[PDB]
């Protein structure tokens, strides 16, 4: 729709509200999947963070 209606800054942002919201969650869910050495603690602590982070959003 840019190459082919007027479009400016304040419109594309508000159009992307339900995405820039969903994206902020991943910055906190993934932050606990990156801050950590054995292969069994990096995978257990990750998979357990999700099941904890979902019960927060219920």
């Amino acid at each position: 729709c840019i190459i082919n209606t007027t479009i400016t800054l304040a419109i594309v942002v508000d159009k992307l509200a339900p995405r820039l919201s969903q994206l902020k969650v991943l910055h906190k869910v993934f932050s606990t999947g990156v801050a950590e050495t054995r292969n069994v603690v990096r995978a257990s602590h990750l998979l357990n963070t999700l099941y904890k982070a979902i019960l927060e959003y219920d």
Binding site: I2, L9, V13, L16, L20
Partner: protein
């Protein structure tokens, strides 16, 4: 101090690729 003086629509295209001007861009940068 010199500046590039970009047009307006060019910014949105650039923002899509990333996906007061120094202020508004600073927020999208955080994304």
């Amino acid at each position: 101090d010199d500046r590039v003086l970009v047009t307006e629509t060019q910014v949105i295209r650039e923002t899509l690729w990333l996906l007061c001007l120094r202020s508004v861009l600073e927020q999208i940068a955080a994304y």
